[PDB]
RNA sequence: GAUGAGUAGGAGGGCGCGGCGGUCGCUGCAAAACCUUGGGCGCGAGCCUGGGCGGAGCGGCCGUCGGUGCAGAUCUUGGUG
RNA sequence: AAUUGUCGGGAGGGAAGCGGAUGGGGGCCGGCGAUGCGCCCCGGUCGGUGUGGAACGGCGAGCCGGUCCGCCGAUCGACUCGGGGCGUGGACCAGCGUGGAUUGGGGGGGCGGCCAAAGCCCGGGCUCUCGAUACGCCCGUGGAACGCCGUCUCCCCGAUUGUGGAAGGCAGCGCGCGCCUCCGGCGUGCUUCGGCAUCUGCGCGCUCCGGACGCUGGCCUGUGGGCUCCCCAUUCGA
């Protein structure tokens, strides 16, 4: 399958937004939280501090949610759901759900080859 | 005055405006030459720094 | 920097769509979105806006008041973005063509008995 | 028919004569008489089934009206000019410029006998044109073109003979100028205190 | 009763792009041609060393008037009103 | 026709000045009818009166520029925002460059680039202005329809001056950059357009 | 076409947890949980997936509901420097 | 999970961590990167106008259809069928060319303004000296070059960048549609006598013209390429 997308993917930022002071404290997890403190230097955006996520970082709508291979992911749990991508094989690629058995993955992979549907994790748990 | 000016203009088919206008820029003109009086700064005198002098 | 208020953006709120989930109302909105755009008619634009409005902004119209405003205008079609109710204080009901979102059971019976017609906005 | 352009250009896109002047020169007045006092009116100049239908409509790029123009030749470079190669395996060697090919590249020769540089194509951006000129009037390279340097290792004997034929006519001209043979046999290099932006070539 | 069924142009600098300027001001071409032709004549005239628009009497009057005006421009005050500083002012 | 008129006015002024010189008198040039105003200070710490006047002049951003007709009403407004602006008398060259390079028309309260004469005609057509040359002529001569023609022009978004400013905090007379600089506004228009 | 600061505060659109009414699925050919210098998506809350461990359950979607989201409270209980 | 031992990698001149930017060393990734397509004949395989049936349909009794089976005629076509020949070529990176937009820098030319520059040079008249061999004043429609300011215009170099994917539109021209000796010449109207959108329509083309195209090379299981992952170093911030 030849991906239909042609515009290059431009990531405004590739680093993640780490919660402030999650390095200092084990109990403070890395998932982002907006600092609400009155004196918070991060909230006040002093230079040399952690950056906060804002809408300006939004990616181009034409390349948003596109994988590096040039397709968009759709999660499939069986062979029937795979057939939904027959007419979108140049736009959407399939990914087999993490909990599908190896026996049922062989059926999905074989069916995807007939439909020319890209499978992102076709080598999963077959050894 | 505005009513009559518009009436006098309506009969002759000439659309005009009766609005007042603020003072605009003056046009160019020639001024006849005359004797020129030269103005220069005055030398300072401390005695004159008082109404009527010291 | 730019010396504007709220970055030059509007701070006014108006209804751009009905708040209701009524499937029939949404079909009427689609019908009159098309009519307003493709005709430029002021009547269609007004009708479209009133279909968005809340219940209190679509008050009912009594049949008696409908008759008084329709006196001497039999040929014209009465249009109401709202409900038409029956009025026991009105005795003589002339034949009239009325378009409304809803007719009460008594109001519909009296209008139909008098030879009139109750229309919907798709028939209008 | 007309032998020369009616309206020479003062600058690119502006003719020397106005519309009123051009009407006289175009002769439309004469044409009007021959056609009953009217300018003649002309008329405008008057499959296999697919084997596969794509699911997504194909998009064709919009029209671009800009057309590439031939590569320009630097004013410093004239036939017979000595060039200094600035890059590649022959960096620093002094060669003789013969002509510019249709691709815009420069055709140069060592000559091969003096410095071992054969008939080769060198990009203009990687050479410096000096002020030394060697006569190449007797050199004939009309047979050489872009296709002569196209791939399809032993060098065929045909090209070796072709090098010598072009080379032979050029050696006599080079030998005429004293110390020119040694000049073309030595590579150019920068020594201490040598500033390229001040060097005269 | 329905009415019949119904992208930004990249702005280019007309001060540099000739065709863009002619689209806005067609007379600009005539102005361009005349300026180029006028300059060419002057350049040619200077090389050939090619050789008045005022009467001889008029020229004399103009020189006299300008010379008289210049005299008033450089004229100085007599500094007579400063009686207390006559010596200092010279 | 406009090109011929501009040349005649320039030569007409020269002739009159020479005529007055010959007779020994003076020729007072006509007072400037058109001004070009540029905002040189930012939007921080604005006193309320200055803030309102700059809004009425459509100077809401530093280095924005607009034309302004000369009359006692407008001149007195300008006098009250002297330290925040610099202005002067624009010549024909300045008006051409501004309108041609940075000219945008206000159509239905939208900023539209003057790429074609159709844009000018869409708004000013009823006033007889159908091309950018007509628009230039109306501005330079301050014609009868100056108000509509000038308001049709979106305030010019000029760049920071090439070469910088001297001192925005002082008046041009003191060696600064604020206030009336008369014909020297053109020198600044070159470096900011 | 214009435009983008925000404490107290307001509102919108979304993310996540556990049930219920439905609907579409997964699982001893290995579910949940947990581990990982595997990889990717989203501005972000989060999401998807490889490998490992584990050995019996689980998830998506629509609606609807709630004892539904923690770094602090000399917070509680337990554990540990 | 806190916390601890051990093995392995790494760092450490009175904290460490953290933001941003690269680099070194690791680790990881083949949807990390293609190998097809078009046209030929050799063979193989599989189906083909007009009449018969079977089960149905679109439009609204009647017209208008396809699918499947069979029979004739017609004799071609198809083929993720196998070989051969010819043409063509994918991902990423780099270079170059020609241009658009934005922008910085450099060089030249024309014209105008001034005391219709001043001055200087030439010619003429006056004045006649202490810094001693002057100081300067006035004249000429004399001459050769500058100066400042304004304006018109030509050329050269570098930098960043290609968003859009429906339109050969808009604008300005060229060549034909009439002849000549062809850098140009030949007809009306207007003209400042230089010129002029006054005649300047059609057809086919060109261009600074409704947003970048073209060419070439490198590399493609490698010591390659990529990386948002890991450790560390360095400059800035903190
Ligand atoms: K369920
Ligand atoms: K994981
Ligand atoms: K739920
Ligand atoms: K100049
Ligand atoms: K470029
Ligand atoms: K490669
Ligand atoms: K650092
Ligand atoms: Mg990210
Ligand atoms: Mg505070
Ligand atoms: Mg798993
Ligand atoms: Mg802003
Ligand atoms: Mg605000
Ligand atoms: Mg301040
Ligand atoms: Mg702006
Ligand atoms: Mg600079
Ligand atoms: Mg400064
Ligand atoms: Mg201050
Ligand atoms: Mg905000
Ligand atoms: Mg759940
Ligand atoms: Mg870890
Ligand atoms: Mg979920
Ligand atoms: Mg509960
Ligand atoms: Mg709770
Ligand atoms: Mg806690
Ligand atoms: Mg808290
Ligand atoms: Mg505690
Ligand atoms: Mg405790
Ligand atoms: Mg303890
Ligand atoms: Mg642990
Ligand atoms: Mg001059
Ligand atoms: Mg593009």
Author numbering:
A (entry chain g): 2 to 128
B (entry chain V): 111 to 164
C (entry chain S): 2 to 125
D (entry chain H): 3 to 48, 55 to 160, 181 to 229
E (entry chain F): 306 to 311, 317 to 361, 365 to 403
F (entry chain I): 50 to 242
Reproduce text from the manuscript describing this model.
Ribosomes are fundamental to all forms of life on earth. Their activity is regulated via chemical modifications of the four rRNA species: 25S, 18S, 5.8S, and 5S. Here, we report the structure of a plant cytosolic ribosome and a quantitative mass spectrometry analysis of its rRNAs. The overall structure of a plant ribosome is generally conserved relative to its eukaryotic counterparts, including in regions that are responsible for the binding of mRNA and tRNAs.
For zinc finger protein eL34, whose aberrant expression in humans is associated with malignancies (Fan et al., 2017), no density corresponding to the zinc ion is found in the plant ribosome structure, and three of four cysteines that form the binding site are absent. In addition, we found a modification in the remaining cysteine 44, thus eliminating the zinc finger motif. A phylogenetic analysis showed that the structure-derived observation is conserved in Viridiplantae. This suggests a lower effect of zinc deficiency on protein synthesis in plants. Therefore, the zinc finger previously believed to be universal is absent from plant ribosomes, contributing to physiological functioning of plant metabolism at lower nutrient concentrations. For example, 2′-O-methylguanosine 1857 and 2′-O-methylcytidine 1849, together with the conserved modification 2′-O-methyladenosine 827, shape the N-terminal region of eL37 through hydrophobic interactions. This region is involved in constructing the peptide exit tunnel. In a similar way, 2′-O-methyladenosine 886 and conserved 2′-O-methylcytosine 2920 directly interact with the modified residue 3-methylhistidine 246 of uL3 through hydrogen bonding. This modification is crucial for proper pre-rRNA processing, polysome formation, and correct ribosomal function (Malecki et al., 2021). In the large subunit, most human-specific modifications are concentrated at the bottom, in proximity to the two largest ESs—ES3 and ES6.
